[PDB]
């Protein structure tokens, strides 16, 4: 009797997945980078590691980060000396921090996004929560459902232990959720807290120390939907195409293991080199079908895993230095916030473009690209179209 | 110049997401339930807990499980006394086990599914990996990509720390991936290994002890795609509609925390009672739009979290006892394999239906339902249609 083709036709959305709102949040503790080597070597009881402290000072001086927001404070760290050691049993203490803070911070960003969207939160049909800090059952998805008062029947996607590329992953996922389901409105929350990876310095693990110079905390929330209601909802960016790939010759480049001592961080290969060697292939896959090959003619969002990734991509492609402005502004003001960072850059770019009266949310350009980079080595690509004014 | 509506139209699939292959695998160590209380109390050095052992014997006798397959062996357990204690630091040892075994076991199931599907593995465009045992960066998704020789540009969905309902979650996710992307072929792998939750007995944590009577190991893999190539690919079941909800009055019913002592398991409420009180609402949401209200007139797959869930759902709805046959056969032969279990039941049901010359893969019936149950308390619903012969 019943027709599945009829059901399928009536069930799906029509237009491209669209970002309809963006909100962000960060812990209230603002930590200046200029003075961070002094603070960090003191709080970790490592002032006798003179050579190492000098290396960290250079790391921070070259990081192109002015400040970061951190859940961790001096007082919290003083109560948790095992977190301050380089490698001491501490996962239970770290989990207790982030199982609460990830959803708390995610809620602040989410409320802001929902306020901007302006529609009833009961119309949110899907929820994607993404983090690399902590895991729990029920997850942070359940917690944000409860904290926000979403409908119990929201469809949840709990993305745990994902890594720095997953700001692209959540867009790639939200696109299919929104596009295949008529009426669907996806709340997307990325919430990253460095309490699981903070640890003291060791001079035979300089890669771990790099993490301590770069990673900071933050959450970003989006509303994503197809078929926006004109004059009621307000498109910011459209998604058009996505990809994920694993770069050749990159095995072990970025790893992270969740252990009794917390989440470890390792870099075994040249990540700026691998990303810049492989970014052209990603761009030609994404844009040669759209007939575009001038990569200064698109707007850019790149996960700022560290400044050398950006410098080497700029140099490889001969990007004008201004292409990375929004990206570098977020790196400067917040550090590498893992999966949330790219979403902060989208917010920065559309806010500047509208405040400065440019013709589109994409710095006055039509087409744009968003890249996530992280363990794999994985590259996420999202092709974007801007919106006029 | 370029038309996003044109791109969107050309990009999407037409028909319902279809299961095209199912393969399963389990660790080679088969553990008989009849003798498990003796084995378990001895290996955990708990033979002096006489009262507790008697309770466990009853638990196992009432479990309706004949045997389970377990990665853990006597020899492994003898080398890991901290895993044998009720609560001892042991996550690093457990992670070392399951970061390897989850993808190893998942690969065996996946190879079988791909062999049944019969098409080139280079045509797999998306990969969903799901587990509740262990986490790592890069994840098990990366590992199975490498182990199977999938394309580096497979689009990956790493579902970690998900819990027992996520066999429905992965179907709910695969449906949108397949339906919104022309040509997409999704490899779905659920792989569950009880080495992260195994622990010794304690008489003030009878809920933890229940876990030790019920959970066993297994992996299941699917190929999911829309628009199957007739006479080349072979439909088994179609997905038509999905939902996820959180039962009222269930806060804290099933929890699990990942700690330095491994993954804990708690039951604070009556799970059979909550599921049976809420299963009718789920069925009417799923089937009243299809005009069906006779729940013996559909085929059934229910996550067998324990036999009392099944008994109480059967009694609530007045299911004929045969409705749960496939479900109970999997519980009997394999135990509760968390997210993978429902996929084993789909395999059992279609294999029996074809071996016994019934008219459809759904025991000769047209429409069916698949339920996942787990932390939340969460209920996943997937509405299925069978395939003729």
Coordinates of C-alpha atoms in Angstrom, one line a residue, chain B:
Chain B
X1 CA 27.8 32.5 -12.8
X2 CA 27.6 29.1 -11.2
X3 CA 24.2 27.7 -10.0
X4 CA 24.1 26.2 -6.5
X5 CA 20.6 24.9 -7.2
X6 CA 21.9 23.0 -10.2
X7 CA 24.8 21.7 -8.1
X8 CA 22.5 20.6 -5.3
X9 CA 20.2 18.8 -7.7
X10 CA 23.0 16.9 -9.4
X11 CA 24.7 16.1 -6.1
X12 CA 21.9 14.2 -4.3
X13 CA 20.7 10.6 -4.4
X14 CA 17.1 9.6 -5.3
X15 CA 15.9 6.6 -3.4
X16 CA 15.8 5.4 0.2
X17 CA 19.0 4.3 2.0
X18 CA 19.3 0.6 1.6
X19 CA 21.3 -2.1 3.5
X20 CA 23.2 -4.0 0.8
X21 CA 25.4 -6.3 2.9
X22 CA 25.9 -7.4 6.5
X23 CA 29.0 -9.2 7.9
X24 CA 29.8 -10.0 11.5
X25 CA 32.8 -11.2 13.6
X26 CA 33.7 -12.0 17.2
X27 CA 36.8 -12.8 19.3
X28 CA 37.7 -16.5 19.1
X29 CA 37.4 -17.1 22.8
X30 CA 33.9 -18.6 23.5
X31 CA 32.8 -18.3 27.1
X32 CA 30.0 -20.6 28.3
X33 CA 27.5 -18.8 30.6
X34 CA 26.6 -22.0 32.6
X35 CA 30.1 -22.0 34.2
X36 CA 30.8 -18.3 34.0
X37 CA 30.1 -17.5 37.7
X38 CA 32.7 -20.0 38.8
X39 CA 35.2 -18.7 36.2
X40 CA 34.6 -15.0 37.0
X41 CA 34.7 -15.2 40.8
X42 CA 37.9 -17.3 40.6
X43 CA 39.7 -15.1 38.1
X44 CA 38.8 -12.0 40.2
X45 CA 40.0 -13.6 43.4
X46 CA 36.5 -13.2 44.9
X47 CA 35.6 -16.7 46.0
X48 CA 35.2 -15.5 49.5
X49 CA 32.3 -13.3 48.4
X50 CA 29.9 -16.2 48.8
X51 CA 26.6 -14.3 49.0
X52 CA 27.7 -12.2 46.0
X53 CA 28.6 -15.2 44.0
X54 CA 25.2 -16.7 44.6
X55 CA 23.6 -13.5 43.3
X56 CA 25.8 -13.6 40.2
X57 CA 24.8 -17.2 39.6
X58 CA 21.2 -16.2 39.6
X59 CA 22.0 -13.2 37.3
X60 CA 23.7 -15.5 34.8
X61 CA 21.0 -18.2 35.1
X62 CA 18.3 -15.7 34.3
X63 CA 20.3 -13.9 31.6
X64 CA 19.0 -16.0 28.8
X65 CA 22.6 -16.0 27.4
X66 CA 24.2 -19.4 26.6
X67 CA 27.6 -18.0 25.6
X68 CA 29.6 -14.9 24.8
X69 CA 32.8 -14.2 22.8
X70 CA 35.4 -12.4 24.7
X71 CA 38.7 -10.8 23.8
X72 CA 39.7 -11.2 27.4
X73 CA 41.1 -14.6 28.2
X74 CA 42.3 -16.2 31.4
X75 CA 45.9 -15.6 30.4
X76 CA 45.3 -11.9 29.6
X77 CA 43.4 -11.5 32.9
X78 CA 46.2 -13.2 34.9
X79 CA 48.7 -10.6 33.4
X80 CA 46.4 -7.7 34.4
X81 CA 45.3 -8.0 38.0
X82 CA 44.3 -4.3 38.1
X83 CA 41.7 -5.1 35.4
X84 CA 40.4 -7.9 37.7
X85 CA 39.9 -5.7 40.7
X86 CA 36.6 -3.8 41.1
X87 CA 38.3 -0.4 41.0
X88 CA 42.0 -0.1 40.2
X89 CA 44.0 2.2 37.9
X90 CA 43.9 0.3 34.6
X91 CA 42.8 2.5 31.8
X92 CA 46.2 2.5 30.1
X93 CA 46.2 -1.3 29.9
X94 CA 42.6 -1.4 28.7
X95 CA 43.2 1.2 26.1
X96 CA 46.2 -0.7 24.8
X97 CA 43.9 -3.7 24.3
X98 CA 41.0 -2.1 22.7
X99 CA 42.7 0.6 20.5
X100 CA 44.0 -2.4 18.6
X101 CA 41.2 -4.9 19.0
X102 CA 38.3 -2.6 18.0
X103 CA 39.6 -2.0 14.5
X104 CA 41.0 -5.6 14.2
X105 CA 37.6 -7.1 14.9
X106 CA 35.8 -4.4 12.9
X107 CA 38.1 -5.3 9.9
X108 CA 37.0 -8.9 10.0
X109 CA 33.3 -8.0 9.9
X110 CA 33.9 -5.3 7.3
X111 CA 35.8 -7.7 4.9
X112 CA 32.8 -10.1 5.1
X113 CA 30.3 -7.3 4.3
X114 CA 32.4 -6.0 1.4
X115 CA 32.8 -9.6 0.1
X116 CA 29.0 -10.0 0.2
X117 CA 28.4 -6.7 -1.5
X118 CA 30.8 -7.7 -4.2
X119 CA 31.7 -4.3 -5.5
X120 CA 35.1 -2.6 -5.4
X121 CA 36.1 -1.2 -2.0
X122 CA 37.3 2.0 -3.8
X123 CA 33.6 2.8 -4.3
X124 CA 33.1 3.2 -0.6
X125 CA 32.7 6.9 -0.1
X126 CA 31.8 7.2 3.6
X127 CA 32.8 5.3 6.7
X128 CA 31.0 5.3 10.0
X129 CA 32.9 3.6 12.9
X130 CA 31.1 3.2 16.2
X131 CA 32.4 1.9 19.5
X132 CA 31.9 2.3 23.2
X133 CA 35.3 0.8 24.1
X134 CA 38.4 3.1 24.0
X135 CA 39.2 6.3 22.2
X136 CA 42.3 7.4 20.3
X137 CA 43.6 10.1 17.9
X138 CA 43.6 9.3 14.9
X139 CA 40.6 7.2 15.7
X140 CA 39.5 3.7 14.8
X141 CA 38.1 5.2 11.6
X142 CA 41.6 6.1 10.5
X143 CA 42.8 2.6 11.5
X144 CA 40.1 0.8 9.5
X145 CA 40.8 3.0 6.5
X146 CA 44.4 1.9 6.7
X147 CA 43.6 -1.8 7.5
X148 CA 41.0 -2.2 4.7
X149 CA 42.8 -0.2 2.1
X150 CA 39.9 2.2 1.6
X151 CA 40.5 5.4 -0.4
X152 CA 42.3 8.1 1.6
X153 CA 39.4 10.5 0.8
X154 CA 36.8 8.3 2.3
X155 CA 34.5 10.6 4.4
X156 CA 34.8 9.5 8.0
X157 CA 32.3 9.7 11.0
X158 CA 34.1 8.5 14.2
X159 CA 31.4 7.8 16.8
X160 CA 33.1 7.2 20.2
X161 CA 31.8 6.5 23.7
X162 CA 28.3 6.1 22.2
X163 CA 26.6 3.4 24.3
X164 CA 24.1 0.6 23.6
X165 CA 21.6 2.6 21.5
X166 CA 24.1 3.5 18.8
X167 CA 23.4 0.6 16.5
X168 CA 20.3 2.7 15.7
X169 CA 22.4 6.0 15.7
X170 CA 24.7 4.7 13.0
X171 CA 21.7 3.7 10.8
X172 CA 20.1 7.1 11.4
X173 CA 23.4 8.7 10.3
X174 CA 24.0 6.4 7.3
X175 CA 20.6 7.1 6.0
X176 CA 21.3 10.8 5.6
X177 CA 24.8 10.2 4.2
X178 CA 23.5 7.8 1.6
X179 CA 20.3 9.7 0.6
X180 CA 21.8 13.1 0.2
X181 CA 24.8 12.1 -1.9
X182 CA 24.5 10.5 -5.4
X183 CA 26.6 7.4 -5.6
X184 CA 27.5 7.3 -1.9
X185 CA 28.2 3.9 -0.4
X186 CA 28.6 3.9 3.3
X187 CA 30.6 1.3 5.2
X188 CA 29.1 1.1 8.7
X189 CA 31.2 -0.7 11.4
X190 CA 30.1 -1.2 15.0
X191 CA 32.8 -2.9 17.1
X192 CA 32.4 -3.5 20.8
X193 CA 35.0 -5.0 23.2
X194 CA 34.3 -5.5 26.9
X195 CA 37.9 -5.1 28.0
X196 CA 37.3 -1.5 29.0
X197 CA 34.4 -2.4 31.3
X198 CA 35.4 -5.8 32.7
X199 CA 36.1 -5.5 36.5
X200 CA 35.8 -7.5 39.6
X201 CA 32.6 -7.8 41.8
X202 CA 31.6 -5.5 44.7
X203 CA 28.6 -6.2 46.8
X204 CA 27.5 -2.5 47.0
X205 CA 27.6 -2.2 43.2
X206 CA 25.2 -4.9 41.9
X207 CA 24.5 -2.8 38.9
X208 CA 28.1 -3.0 37.8
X209 CA 27.9 -6.8 38.4
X210 CA 24.8 -7.0 36.1
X211 CA 27.1 -5.7 33.3
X212 CA 29.5 -8.6 33.9
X213 CA 26.7 -11.1 33.3
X214 CA 25.4 -9.5 30.1
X215 CA 28.0 -7.8 27.9
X216 CA 30.0 -9.6 25.3
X217 CA 32.1 -8.8 22.3
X218 CA 31.3 -8.5 18.6
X219 CA 31.5 -6.4 15.5
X220 CA 29.0 -5.9 12.6
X221 CA 29.5 -4.2 9.3
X222 CA 27.0 -2.9 6.8
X223 CA 27.1 -1.5 3.3
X224 CA 24.4 1.2 3.0
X225 CA 23.5 3.0 -0.2
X226 CA 20.7 4.7 -2.1
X227 CA 19.8 3.7 -5.7
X228 CA 21.1 0.2 -5.7
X229 CA 22.3 -1.1 -9.1
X230 CA 19.6 -3.7 -10.0
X231 CA 20.9 -7.3 -10.6
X232 CA 24.4 -6.2 -9.4
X233 CA 23.7 -5.0 -5.9
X234 CA 21.2 -6.8 -3.6
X235 CA 18.9 -4.9 -1.3
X236 CA 18.2 -6.5 2.1
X237 CA 16.4 -3.8 4.0
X238 CA 15.4 -0.2 3.3
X239 CA 15.3 2.6 5.8
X240 CA 12.4 4.9 5.7
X241 CA 12.2 7.0 8.9
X242 CA 14.2 7.5 12.1
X243 CA 13.9 9.2 15.5
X244 CA 15.8 9.6 18.7
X245 CA 14.3 10.5 22.0
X246 CA 15.0 10.8 25.8
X247 CA 12.5 9.0 27.9
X248 CA 10.9 11.1 30.7
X249 CA 11.7 10.4 34.3
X250 CA 14.8 8.6 33.3
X251 CA 17.7 10.9 34.4
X252 CA 20.6 8.8 35.4
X253 CA 19.0 5.4 34.4
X254 CA 22.1 4.2 32.5
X255 CA 25.5 5.9 33.0
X256 CA 29.1 5.1 32.2
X257 CA 32.2 7.2 33.1
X258 CA 35.6 6.7 31.5
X259 CA 38.0 6.9 34.4
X260 CA 41.6 5.9 35.3
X261 CA 40.0 2.5 36.4
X262 CA 38.3 2.0 33.0
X263 CA 34.7 2.4 32.0
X264 CA 32.3 2.2 34.8
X265 CA 28.7 1.0 34.4
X266 CA 25.7 2.2 36.6
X267 CA 22.0 1.5 36.6
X268 CA 20.0 3.8 38.8
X269 CA 16.5 3.2 37.6
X270 CA 14.3 0.5 36.2
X271 CA 15.4 0.2 32.6
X272 CA 12.9 -2.5 31.5
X273 CA 10.1 -0.4 33.1
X274 CA 11.2 2.8 31.5
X275 CA 11.6 1.3 28.1
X276 CA 8.3 -0.6 28.2
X277 CA 6.5 2.6 29.5
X278 CA 7.8 4.6 26.5
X279 CA 7.9 2.1 23.7
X280 CA 4.3 2.7 22.6
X281 CA 4.8 6.4 22.2
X282 CA 7.8 5.6 19.9
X283 CA 5.8 3.2 17.9
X284 CA 2.8 5.5 17.4
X285 CA 5.2 8.3 16.2
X286 CA 6.8 5.9 13.8
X287 CA 3.8 4.0 12.5
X288 CA 0.6 6.0 12.9
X289 CA 1.6 8.0 9.8
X290 CA 2.0 4.7 7.9
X291 CA -1.5 3.7 9.0
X292 CA -0.3 0.7 11.0
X293 CA -1.2 0.0 14.6
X294 CA -0.9 -3.8 14.9
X295 CA 2.6 -4.3 16.2
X296 CA 2.5 -8.0 15.6
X297 CA 2.1 -7.1 11.9
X298 CA 5.6 -5.7 11.7
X299 CA 9.0 -7.4 12.1
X300 CA 11.0 -6.6 15.2
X301 CA 14.6 -5.9 16.2
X302 CA 15.1 -4.8 19.7
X303 CA 18.4 -4.1 21.5
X304 CA 18.5 -6.9 24.0
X305 CA 20.1 -4.9 26.8
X306 CA 18.9 -7.7 29.1
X307 CA 16.1 -10.3 28.8
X308 CA 13.8 -8.3 31.1
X309 CA 13.6 -5.4 28.6
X310 CA 12.4 -7.9 26.0
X311 CA 10.0 -9.7 28.4
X312 CA 8.4 -6.4 29.5
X313 CA 8.1 -5.0 26.0
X314 CA 6.5 -8.3 24.8
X315 CA 4.0 -8.1 27.7
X316 CA 3.2 -4.4 27.4
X317 CA 2.4 -4.7 23.7
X318 CA 1.0 -8.3 23.7
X319 CA 3.6 -9.3 21.2
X320 CA 3.4 -12.9 20.1
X321 CA 6.5 -14.6 21.6
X322 CA 7.8 -15.3 18.2
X323 CA 8.2 -11.6 17.4
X324 CA 11.4 -11.5 19.5
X325 CA 12.8 -14.8 18.1
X326 CA 15.7 -13.3 16.2
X327 CA 16.5 -10.9 19.0
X328 CA 16.6 -13.6 21.6
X329 CA 18.6 -15.9 19.4
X330 CA 21.4 -13.3 19.2
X331 CA 21.2 -12.6 23.0
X332 CA 21.5 -16.4 23.5
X333 CA 24.5 -17.0 21.2
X334 CA 26.4 -13.7 21.8
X335 CA 25.2 -11.7 24.8
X336 CA 24.6 -7.9 24.8
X337 CA 27.2 -6.6 22.3
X338 CA 26.2 -3.0 22.8
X339 CA 25.9 -1.0 19.5
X340 CA 26.7 -4.0 17.3
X341 CA 23.9 -6.2 18.7
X342 CA 21.0 -4.9 16.6
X343 CA 23.1 -5.3 13.5
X344 CA 23.7 -9.0 14.4
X345 CA 19.9 -9.3 14.8
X346 CA 19.2 -7.9 11.3
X347 CA 21.7 -10.5 10.0
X348 CA 20.0 -13.4 11.9
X349 CA 16.5 -12.3 10.7
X350 CA 17.4 -12.1 7.0
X351 CA 19.4 -15.3 7.1
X352 CA 16.6 -17.3 8.7
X353 CA 14.0 -15.7 6.4
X354 CA 15.9 -16.7 3.3
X355 CA 17.0 -20.1 4.5
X356 CA 13.4 -20.9 5.4
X357 CA 12.0 -19.7 2.1
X358 CA 9.8 -16.9 3.5
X359 CA 8.6 -14.2 1.2
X360 CA 10.6 -11.3 2.5
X361 CA 13.9 -10.7 4.5
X362 CA 11.6 -9.4 7.3
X363 CA 10.2 -12.8 8.3
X364 CA 7.7 -12.5 5.4
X365 CA 6.3 -9.2 6.6
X366 CA 6.6 -5.8 4.8
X367 CA 7.3 -3.2 7.5
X368 CA 9.6 -3.5 10.5
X369 CA 11.1 -1.6 13.4
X370 CA 14.5 -1.5 15.0
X371 CA 15.1 -0.1 18.5
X372 CA 18.3 0.9 20.2
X373 CA 18.2 1.6 24.0
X374 CA 21.0 3.1 26.2
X375 CA 22.3 6.0 28.3
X376 CA 19.9 8.9 28.5
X377 CA 17.7 6.9 28.7
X378 CA 17.8 7.2 24.9
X379 CA 15.5 5.3 22.5
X380 CA 16.5 5.1 18.8
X381 CA 13.8 4.2 16.3
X382 CA 14.5 3.1 12.7
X383 CA 11.5 2.2 10.5
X384 CA 12.5 -0.5 8.0
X385 CA 10.9 -2.1 4.9
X386 CA 11.9 -5.7 4.0
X387 CA 12.8 -6.9 0.5
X388 CA 11.0 -9.6 -1.4
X389 CA 12.5 -13.1 -1.2

